[PDB]
């Protein structure tokens with residue numbers, strides 16, 4: 082493997098999670 | 114029965130409860146639906162601590178010689194505490210720290226000992242979740258990474274360690290842990306482990322960012338997936354090969370060890386880890402229910418599911434244990450056949466099947482050595498690896514929502530962060546703080562440290578908190594007031610099973626267990642199991658003695674929480690003077 086497959090999986094999961102965190106922070110602020 | 118003056122001032126009036134549900138719509142959180150609360154209780158009384166610990170202790174004592182004491186103490190010490198915590202939360206409309214402080218101001222120590230205990234069990238279980246994620250991230254590869262050994266610089270010799278051990282054992286100890294040869298050899302931080310720990314904490318934060326506003330939607334997938342996937346594994350397990358052999362082995366217990374006080378002590382302490390009692394999350398969660406919510410029926414339903422799931426998971430493990438032992442018996446057998454066929458057209462092995470079933474697994478081997486090896490032997494091995502680590506990841510998460518509740522709510526109730534600041538800020542800082550503390554388990558010598566929490570150090574505090582909760586509700590608050598309170602909430606006084614278990618049985622059992630938990634457990638010498646490829650009989654088990662300085666760790670990790678109870682009480686009765 083040129084890239085280790087666990088790092089491709091970690092990247093996608095971590096990307097999804099950080100986008101989740103950011104959406105939920107801005108949602109929480111917008112709940113007025 | 115103990116003199117408690119001023120109680121009526123501190124706690125909400127019984128008549129005030131009828132005029133609190135429709136006027137405290139704000140300031141206090143509310144469950145959107147009873148389903149959300151029941152799914153949260155399911156995930157906290159049947160997450161890890163049930164599903165992770167129970168099966169290990171089954172195979173570390175006896176398949177069925179452990180379930181008997183477990184199910185007895187579930188009924189006589191667990192159901193009563195579960196009801197007590199549910200009711201007391203629902204009536205006093207506060208968390209653990211609010212509840213014990215309002216029953217008596219000297220008992221704020223009880224609530225601080227629950228927050229620290231909850232902290233410590235969260236730190237433990239989130240490291241296990243980081244390992245689970247490491248294995249889930251390596252499960253998208255047709256040949257699973259733990260199915261084959263590496264090689265030598267000659268690219269013609271298998272790594273001697275792997276050779277002397279197994280690709281599974283080598284993927285655990287070397288490729289995952291990169292383990293050192295003792296706790297004194299710290300080494301450094303395994304970057305790939307650090308990435309997995311960050312992932313665990315970060316997912317937990319995404320789900321717990323606004324407490325039950327966010328965790329109550331999370332539980333619809335996090336407390337439902339594990340149970341379906343564990344059903345899939347029950348069916349896959351029973352049709353494995355030697356599975357029925359393993360399941361006969363846990364339902365033929367030796368009774369000679371049913372008379373061993375360690376079997377009773379482990380079962381004692383397992384009842385509080387299984388239900389997540391004496392952590393304080395259950396009290397907080399029950400405090401968001403309607404004052405007319407049937408907490409008796411909830412405690413019974415949760416309990417029945419807890420016991421049934423304990424026995425079910427033991428069937429899923431032993432079916433896989435039975436499968437491994439039978440494929441060894443056969444293998445070993447097929448090599449004793451091949452020795453005389455290679456000699457006669459003479460070394461041999463002694464390998465009955467009962468010597469393979471009764472071969473105990475130290476540490477986390479049941480998850481990352483036994484279940485991982487058996488999944489590689491199955492077809493579509495990558496789809497069973499992903500289902501197995503997704504099941505365990507969701508169980509971890511469901512359990513982590515309760516443990517986070519039990520740290521966040523007390524810190525809110527200690528008014529330590531500016532009230533102005535959103536909870537999101539406080540939740541985040543707890544996740545960062547605990548993430549940084551969990552760098553010790555990312556070291557070369559991390560497993561060794563995690564196995565200290567597996568010592569009696571992880572349990573003494575839980576036994577002390579549970580006793581004090583029972584005692585304080587029955588003798589400091591008064592069981593007679595508590596019965597009129599329940600009668601108000603659900604419409605009938607708790608029956609004589611609850612009166613006997615609260616007043617005598619449960620307290621006395623807890624006391625006995627705490628006493629004889631030192632007569633044997635504490636008195637014994639703390640030893641742990643090291644993996645050193647430079648050891649004679651190398652793939653075999655070398656238990657050594659922990660250094661003296663680790664006593665300086667057990668002494669706090671357990672002492673402090675326990676000593677917080679009296680320590681705060683003595684502080685409060687010398688400030689009064």
Ligand SMILES: O=C(/C=C/c1ccc(C(F)(F)F)cc1)NCC(=O)N1CCNC(=O)C1
Nearest residue numbers: 164165166168169429430476477479480567
């Ligand atoms: O390895 C396990 C659980 C494995 C497992 C559980 C469930 C399943 C299921 F069947 F559900 F799939 C499959 C594997 N537990 C270790 C443990 O509890 N300890 C604490 C005490 N001592 C120690 O050092 C280790």
Ligand SMILES: *[C@@H]1O[C@H](CO)[C@@H](O)[C@H](O)[C@H]1NC(C)=O
Nearest residue numbers: 287291292293299300301557
């Ligand atoms: C493992 O630990 C040793 C000793 O600390 C270190 O030299 C090595 O870089 C680490 N990494 C791997 C992949 O083993």
